[PDB]
Amino acid sequence: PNVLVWMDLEMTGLDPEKDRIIEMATIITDGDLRTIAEGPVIVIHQKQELIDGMDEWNTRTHNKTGLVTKVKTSRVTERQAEIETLDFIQRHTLKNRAPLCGNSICQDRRFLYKYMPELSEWLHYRNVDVSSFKEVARHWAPSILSGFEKRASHQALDDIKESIEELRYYRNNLILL
Amino acid sequence: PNVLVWMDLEMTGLDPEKDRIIEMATIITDGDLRTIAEGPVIVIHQKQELIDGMDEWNTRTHNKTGLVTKVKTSRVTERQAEIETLDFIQRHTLKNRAPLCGNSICQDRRFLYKYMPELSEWLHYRNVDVSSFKEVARHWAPSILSGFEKRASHQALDDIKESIEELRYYRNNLILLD
Numbered sequence: 001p002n003v004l005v006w007m008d009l010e011m012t013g014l015d016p017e018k019d020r021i022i023e024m025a026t027i028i029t030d031g032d033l034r035t036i037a038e039g040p041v042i043v044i045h046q047k048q049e050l051i052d053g054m055d056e057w058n059t060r061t062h063n064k065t066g067l068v069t070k071v072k073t074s075r076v077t078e079r080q081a082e083i084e085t086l087d088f089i090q091r092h093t094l095k096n097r098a099p100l101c102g103n104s105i106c107q108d109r110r111f112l113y114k115y116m117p118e119l120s121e122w123l124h125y126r127n128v129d130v131s132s133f134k135e136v137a138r139h140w141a142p143s144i145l146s147g148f149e150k151r152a153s154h155q156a157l158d159d160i161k162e163s164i165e166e167l168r169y170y171r172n173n174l175i176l177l
Numbered sequence: 178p179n180v181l182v183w184m185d186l187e188m189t190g191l192d193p194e195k196d197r198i199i200e201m202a203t204i205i206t207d208g209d210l211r212t213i214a215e216g217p218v219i220v221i222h223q224k225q226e227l228i229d230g231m232d233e234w235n236t237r238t239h240n241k242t243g244l245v246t247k248v249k250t251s252r253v254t255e256r257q258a259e260i261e262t263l264d265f266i267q268r269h270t271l272k273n274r275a276p277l278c279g280n281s282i283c284q285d286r287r288f289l290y291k292y293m294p295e296l297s298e299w300l301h302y303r304n305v306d307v308s309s310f311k312e313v314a315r316h317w318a319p320s321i322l323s324g325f326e327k328r329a330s331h332q333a334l335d336d337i338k339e340s341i342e343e344l345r346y347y348r349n350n351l352i353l354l355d
């Protein structure tokens with residue numbers, strides 16, 4: 001009906017013409033942010049040559065989380081990760097009725113549109129940028145922001161939860177029924 | 178200090194590797210949406226070959242607004258449009274302190290990052306997606322939306338105003354202040 005899908009994507013870099021997706025995860029909530037179901041956490045395999053070309057930053061952080069070794073031993077291709085993720089989404093959503101949500105909205109949707117076209121056409125074109133509410137709250141209600149602390153997050157699903165919790169706080173403190 | 182830049186971009190299509198910018202305009206407001214200044218409306222010239230390759234949709238709407246004939250007679254290059262727009266922004270903003278605002282946030286920032294790198298590095302990385310508030314209001318306060326009607330808009334600056342007015346309404350009806 002009008003559920004929301006939340007996704008976390010890790011990539012080898014920022015340029016979609018050169019870089020690729022290496023980890024994705026999905027969580028589906030409803031309109032009032034109560035989670036309907038948690039989706040799969042897929043590590044996509046990329047060629048060992050592509051990983052050696054990443055810059056300092058992406059090599060430091062992806063080796064610090066253990067994603068690089070997961071990619072090395074993964075057998076999952078991009079088309080395969082798309083089907084398993086889309087099979088999860090299709091069970092809880094209708095086509096072209098669910099927007100993307102998170103803090104990397106434009107960054108995620110670039111790689112989604114290029115590397116997973118069937119998933120991107122099942123999603124609705126709209127987005128819910130949680131980051132757009134934090135920048136608005138800086139000017140209109142700065143007193144609210146002291147009462148929220150983003151917590152440590154190590155897994156992909158915990159990254160998604162911390163974004164949903166951030167929007168809960170804007171819902172219960174910044175907005176009006 | 179705390180100002181916001183608003184931009185309206187028209188392109189020959191959606192793929193930045195093939196398509197280009199043909200019209201841009203800028204308006205700068207402050208934190209509470211009172212407009213500080215209105216910027217230039219530049220029509221960027223592209224080769225006549227590129228315009229003939231646009232699909233039905235982009236050819237129908239850009240010929241319906243008269244942009245195609247403006248591009249044909251324009252002498253302004255992309256680097257030139259960037260300097261005049263950046264000269265306007267640099268007068269009212271500080272570097273890396275002003276985010277983008279509008280309803281085509283991701284779509285505009287793709288072409289901005291590729292075709293105008295000096296402008297994109299002067300802007301702050303953050304955005305204010307007005308469209309993200311309309312989708313949120315659909316679930317949390319649908320009673321608000323009946324009281325707003327997007328009005329007809331024909332120029333580029335009037336397109337920007339209608340986005341600013343949309344955010345005014347969310348400010349004065351959806352949010353909680355002080």
Ligand SMILES: [Mn+2]
Binds near residue numbers: 010
């Ligand atoms: Mn993550």
Ligand SMILES: [Mn+2]
Binds near residue numbers: 185187332333
């Ligand atoms: Mn326009």
